[PDB]
Coordinates of C-alpha atoms and ligand atoms in Angstrom, one line a residue:
X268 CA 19.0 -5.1 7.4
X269 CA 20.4 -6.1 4.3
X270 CA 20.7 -9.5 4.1
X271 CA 16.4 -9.6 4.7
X272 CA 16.2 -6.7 2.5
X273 CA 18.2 -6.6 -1.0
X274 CA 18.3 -6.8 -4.7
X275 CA 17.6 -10.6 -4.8
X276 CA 15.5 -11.2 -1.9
X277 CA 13.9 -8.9 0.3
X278 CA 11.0 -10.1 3.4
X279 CA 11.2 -7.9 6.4
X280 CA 8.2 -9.8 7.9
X281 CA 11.1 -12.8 8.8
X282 CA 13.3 -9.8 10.6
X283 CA 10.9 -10.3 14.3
X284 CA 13.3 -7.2 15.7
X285 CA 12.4 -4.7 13.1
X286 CA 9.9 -1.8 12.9
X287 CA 8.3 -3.3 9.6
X288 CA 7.5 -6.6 11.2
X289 CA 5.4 -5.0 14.0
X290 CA 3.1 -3.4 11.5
X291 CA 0.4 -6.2 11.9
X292 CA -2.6 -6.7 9.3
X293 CA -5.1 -4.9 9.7
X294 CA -9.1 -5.8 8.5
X295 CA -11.0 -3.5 6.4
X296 CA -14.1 -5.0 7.0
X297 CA -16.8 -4.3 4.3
X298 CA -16.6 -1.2 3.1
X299 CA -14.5 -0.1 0.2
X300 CA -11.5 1.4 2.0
X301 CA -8.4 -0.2 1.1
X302 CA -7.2 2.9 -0.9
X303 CA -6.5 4.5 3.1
X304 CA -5.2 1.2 4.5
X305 CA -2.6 0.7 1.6
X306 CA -1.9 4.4 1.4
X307 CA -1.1 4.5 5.1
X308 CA 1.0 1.9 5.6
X309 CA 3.3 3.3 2.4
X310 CA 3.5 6.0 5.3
X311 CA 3.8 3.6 8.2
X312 CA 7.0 1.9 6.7
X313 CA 8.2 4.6 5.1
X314 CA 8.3 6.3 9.2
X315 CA 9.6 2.7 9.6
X316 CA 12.7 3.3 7.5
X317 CA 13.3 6.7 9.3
X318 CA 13.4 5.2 12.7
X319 CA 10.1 6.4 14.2
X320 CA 7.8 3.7 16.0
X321 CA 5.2 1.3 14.2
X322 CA 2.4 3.4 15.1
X323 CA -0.8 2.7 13.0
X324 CA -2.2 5.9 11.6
X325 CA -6.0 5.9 12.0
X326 CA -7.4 4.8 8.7
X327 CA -10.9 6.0 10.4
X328 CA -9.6 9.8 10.8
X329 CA -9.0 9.6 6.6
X330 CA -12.0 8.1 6.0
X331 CA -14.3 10.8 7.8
X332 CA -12.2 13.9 7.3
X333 CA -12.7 15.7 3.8
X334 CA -13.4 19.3 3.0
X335 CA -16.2 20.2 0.3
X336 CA -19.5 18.2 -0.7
X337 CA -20.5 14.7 1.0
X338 CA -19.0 11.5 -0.6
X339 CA -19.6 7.7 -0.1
X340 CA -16.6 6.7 1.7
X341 CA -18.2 2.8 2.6
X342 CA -19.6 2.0 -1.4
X343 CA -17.0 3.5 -3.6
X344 CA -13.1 4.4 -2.8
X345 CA -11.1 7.2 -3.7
X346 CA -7.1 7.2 -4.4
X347 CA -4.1 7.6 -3.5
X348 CA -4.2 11.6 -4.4
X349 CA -6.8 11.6 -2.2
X350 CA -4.8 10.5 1.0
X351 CA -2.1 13.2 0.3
X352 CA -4.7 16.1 -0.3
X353 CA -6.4 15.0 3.3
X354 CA -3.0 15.1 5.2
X355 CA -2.4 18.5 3.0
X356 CA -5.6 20.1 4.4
X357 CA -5.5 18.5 7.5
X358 CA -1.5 19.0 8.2
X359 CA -3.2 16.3 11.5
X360 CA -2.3 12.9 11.3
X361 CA -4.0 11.0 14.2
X362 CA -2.7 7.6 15.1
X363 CA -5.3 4.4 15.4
X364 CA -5.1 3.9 18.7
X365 CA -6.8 7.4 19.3
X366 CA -9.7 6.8 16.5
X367 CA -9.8 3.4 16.0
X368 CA -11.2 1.9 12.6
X369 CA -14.4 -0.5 12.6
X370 CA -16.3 -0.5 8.9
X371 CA -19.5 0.5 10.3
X372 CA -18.0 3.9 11.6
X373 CA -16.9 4.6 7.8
X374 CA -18.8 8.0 6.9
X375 CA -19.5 9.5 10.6
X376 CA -18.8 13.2 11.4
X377 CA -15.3 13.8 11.4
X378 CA -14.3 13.7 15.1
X379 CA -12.6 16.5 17.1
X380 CA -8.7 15.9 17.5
X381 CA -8.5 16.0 21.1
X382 CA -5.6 17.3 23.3
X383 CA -3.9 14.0 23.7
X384 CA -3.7 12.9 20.6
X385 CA -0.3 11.7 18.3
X386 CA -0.2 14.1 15.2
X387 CA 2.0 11.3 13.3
X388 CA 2.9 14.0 10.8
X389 CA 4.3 16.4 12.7
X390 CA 8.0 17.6 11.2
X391 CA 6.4 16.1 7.8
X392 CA 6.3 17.6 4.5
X393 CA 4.6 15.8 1.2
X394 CA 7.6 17.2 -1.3
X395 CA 5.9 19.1 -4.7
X396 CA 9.5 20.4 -5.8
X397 CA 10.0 21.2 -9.6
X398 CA 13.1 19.3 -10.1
X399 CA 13.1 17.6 -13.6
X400 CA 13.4 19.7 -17.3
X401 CA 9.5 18.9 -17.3
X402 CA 6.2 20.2 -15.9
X403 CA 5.0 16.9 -14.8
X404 CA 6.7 16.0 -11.1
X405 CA 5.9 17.8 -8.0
X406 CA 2.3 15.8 -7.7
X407 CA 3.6 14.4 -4.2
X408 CA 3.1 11.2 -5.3
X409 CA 4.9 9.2 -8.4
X410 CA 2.5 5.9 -10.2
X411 CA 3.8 3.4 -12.8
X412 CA 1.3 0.9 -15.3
X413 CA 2.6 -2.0 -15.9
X414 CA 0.6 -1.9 -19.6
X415 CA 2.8 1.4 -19.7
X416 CA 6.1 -1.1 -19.1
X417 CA 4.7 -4.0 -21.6
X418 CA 7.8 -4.3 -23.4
X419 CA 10.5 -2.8 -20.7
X420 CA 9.2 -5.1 -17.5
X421 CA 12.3 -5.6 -15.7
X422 CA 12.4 -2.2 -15.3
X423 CA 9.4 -1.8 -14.2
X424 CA 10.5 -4.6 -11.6
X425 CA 13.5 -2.2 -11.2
X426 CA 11.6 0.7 -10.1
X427 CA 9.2 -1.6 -7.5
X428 CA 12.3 -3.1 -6.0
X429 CA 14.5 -0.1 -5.3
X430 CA 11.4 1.6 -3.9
X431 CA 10.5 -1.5 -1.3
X432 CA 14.2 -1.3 -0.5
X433 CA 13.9 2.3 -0.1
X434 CA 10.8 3.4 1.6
X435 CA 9.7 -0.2 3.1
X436 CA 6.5 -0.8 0.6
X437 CA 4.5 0.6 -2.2
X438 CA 1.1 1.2 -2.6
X439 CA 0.2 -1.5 -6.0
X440 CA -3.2 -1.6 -7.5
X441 CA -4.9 -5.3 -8.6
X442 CA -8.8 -6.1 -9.7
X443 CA -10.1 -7.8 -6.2
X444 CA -11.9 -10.6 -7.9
X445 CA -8.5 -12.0 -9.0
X446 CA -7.4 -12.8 -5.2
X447 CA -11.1 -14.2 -4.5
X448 CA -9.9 -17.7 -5.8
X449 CA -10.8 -20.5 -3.2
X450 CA -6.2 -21.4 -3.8
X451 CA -5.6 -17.9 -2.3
X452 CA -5.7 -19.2 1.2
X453 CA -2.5 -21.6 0.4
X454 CA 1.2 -20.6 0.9
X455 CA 1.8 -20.8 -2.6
X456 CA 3.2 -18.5 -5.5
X457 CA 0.2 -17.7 -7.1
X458 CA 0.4 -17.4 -10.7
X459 CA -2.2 -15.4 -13.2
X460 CA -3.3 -12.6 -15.4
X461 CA -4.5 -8.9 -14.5
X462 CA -7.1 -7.2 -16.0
X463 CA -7.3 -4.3 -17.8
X464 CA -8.6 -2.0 -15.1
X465 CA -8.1 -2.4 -11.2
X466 CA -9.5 -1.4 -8.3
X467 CA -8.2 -2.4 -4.7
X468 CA -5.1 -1.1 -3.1
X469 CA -2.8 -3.3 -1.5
X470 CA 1.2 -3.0 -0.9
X471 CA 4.1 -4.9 -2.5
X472 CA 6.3 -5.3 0.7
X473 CA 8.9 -7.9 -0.8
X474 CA 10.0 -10.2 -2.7
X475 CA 11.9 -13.3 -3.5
X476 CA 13.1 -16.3 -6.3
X477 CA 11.5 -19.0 -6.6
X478 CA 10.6 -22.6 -8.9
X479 CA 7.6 -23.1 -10.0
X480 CA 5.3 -25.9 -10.7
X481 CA 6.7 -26.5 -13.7
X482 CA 10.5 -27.0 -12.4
X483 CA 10.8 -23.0 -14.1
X484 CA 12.9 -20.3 -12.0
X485 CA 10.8 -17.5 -11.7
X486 CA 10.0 -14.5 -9.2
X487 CA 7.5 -13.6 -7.0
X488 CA 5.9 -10.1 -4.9
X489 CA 5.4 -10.2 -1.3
X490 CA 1.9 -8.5 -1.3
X491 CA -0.3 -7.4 2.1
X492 CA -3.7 -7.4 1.6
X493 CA -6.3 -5.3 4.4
X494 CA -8.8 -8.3 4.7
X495 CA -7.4 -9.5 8.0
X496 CA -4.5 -12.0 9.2
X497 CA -7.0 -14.9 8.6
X498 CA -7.1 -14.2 4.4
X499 CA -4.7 -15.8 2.5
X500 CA -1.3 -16.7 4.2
X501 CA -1.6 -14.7 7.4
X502 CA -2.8 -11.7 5.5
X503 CA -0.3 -11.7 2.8
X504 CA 0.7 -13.8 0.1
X505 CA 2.7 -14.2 -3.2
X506 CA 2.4 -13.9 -6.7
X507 CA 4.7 -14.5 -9.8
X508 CA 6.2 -11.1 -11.2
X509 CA 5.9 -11.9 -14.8
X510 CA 2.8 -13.8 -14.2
X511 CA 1.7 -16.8 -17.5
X512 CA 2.9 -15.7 -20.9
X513 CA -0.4 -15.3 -22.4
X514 CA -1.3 -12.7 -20.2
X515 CA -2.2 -9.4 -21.8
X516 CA -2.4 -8.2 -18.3
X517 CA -0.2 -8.2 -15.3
X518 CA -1.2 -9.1 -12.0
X519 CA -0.2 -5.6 -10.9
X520 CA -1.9 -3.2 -12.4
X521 CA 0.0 -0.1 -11.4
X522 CA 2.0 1.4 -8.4
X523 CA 2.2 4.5 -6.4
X524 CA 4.9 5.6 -4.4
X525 CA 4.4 9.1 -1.8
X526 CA 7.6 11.4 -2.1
X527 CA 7.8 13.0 1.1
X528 CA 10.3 14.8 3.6
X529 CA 10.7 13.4 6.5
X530 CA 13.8 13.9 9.5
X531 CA 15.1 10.6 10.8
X532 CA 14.2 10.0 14.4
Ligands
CA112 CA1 -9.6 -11.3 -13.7
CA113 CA1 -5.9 -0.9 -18.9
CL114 CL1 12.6 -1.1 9.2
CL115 CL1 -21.1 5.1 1.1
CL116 CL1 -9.7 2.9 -4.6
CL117 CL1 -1.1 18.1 -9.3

């Protein structure tokens, strides 16, 4: 437990007897979707960290199931709002296995929840409590900008770790051109600017120390990607916290972490 998960170093993927490990990748396909697929797996190991199976929730179900006017769920994505309000509506959860995903289903009626299936929400609450001397929490989900943290990023580091510790992942937001380099399919630290806007979801699911190229000690995320275990280094791959100094930019554009109840198993 801790010693593959804490302050220094943290990469469940190496524990082979843990709940986190068995959540494989999973492929997207081509349409614009990653907002569900990072959004659910915040919720996969987040169950993961209360002792309930790896069961795969079924992106497909999210896509398809909306109330109010039609939207294009293949060309353009949504956020991470979005995800809470459909469980919200919903209160149904249905697992993969019972709806399973394929990109060219993205947009179809949403389909009848049938007698057998796993509700993998039930006993789950997404928490909207008025806690702090402000107006502002209670959204059910809590995001961070790294532009926001410019001059304060180890806290912003902080925050990322304690909350991969904590809940298994978060959801983290990057510009997809940025991993489209032909050296993202290595094993290697990679090591670059953000931009100022993003727009694909992926999860920051660890971390770790490291050298770099230059013989300088630096850091680096453990990120999952939903393009398949055949993109970048079996799905996932790593990237320097505090990126090159001339960046205006960091690599991670923003987080979001869900605050939810949920009973331990
Ligand atoms: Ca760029
Ligand atoms: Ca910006
Ligand atoms: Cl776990
Ligand atoms: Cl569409
Ligand atoms: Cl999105
Ligand atoms: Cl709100």
């Amino acid at each position: 437990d801790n010693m593959f998960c804490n302050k220094e170093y943290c990469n469940r993927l190496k524990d082979e007897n843990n709940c986190i490990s068995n959540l494989q990748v999973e492929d997207q396909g081509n349409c614009d979707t990653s907002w569900i697929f990072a959004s659910k797996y915040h919720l996969e190991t987040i169950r993961c960290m209360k002792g309930y199976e790896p069961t795969k929730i079924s992106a497909l179900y999210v896509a398809n199931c909306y109330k109010g006017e039609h939207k294009d769920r293949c060309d353009e994505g949504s956020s991470p709002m979005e995800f809470l309000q459909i469980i919200e509506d919903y209160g149904f959860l249905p697992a993969e296995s019972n709806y399973p995903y394929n990109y060219v289903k993205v947009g179809e009626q949403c389909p009848k929840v049938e007698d057998h299936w796993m509700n993998l929400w039930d006993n789950g609450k997404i928490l909207h409590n008025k806690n702090e001397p402000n107006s502002l929490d209670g959204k059910g989900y809590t995001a961070y900008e790294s532009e926001r943290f410019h001059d304060n990023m180890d806290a912003f580091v902080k925050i990322i770790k304690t909350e991969v510790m904590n809940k298994g992942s978060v959801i983290a937001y990057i510009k997809a051109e940025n991993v489209m380099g032909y050296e993202f399919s290595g094993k290697k630290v990679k090591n670059l600017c953000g931009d100022d806007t993003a727009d694909h979801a992926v999860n920051i699911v660890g971390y770790g120390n490291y050298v770099n190229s230059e013989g300088e000690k630096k850091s680096y995320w453990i990120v999952r990607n939903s393009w398949g275990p055949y993109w970048g280094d079996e799905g996932y791959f790593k990237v320097d916290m505090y990126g090159p100094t001339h960046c205006h930019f960091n690599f991670i554009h923003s987080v979001v972490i869900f605050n939810v109840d949920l009973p331990m198993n």
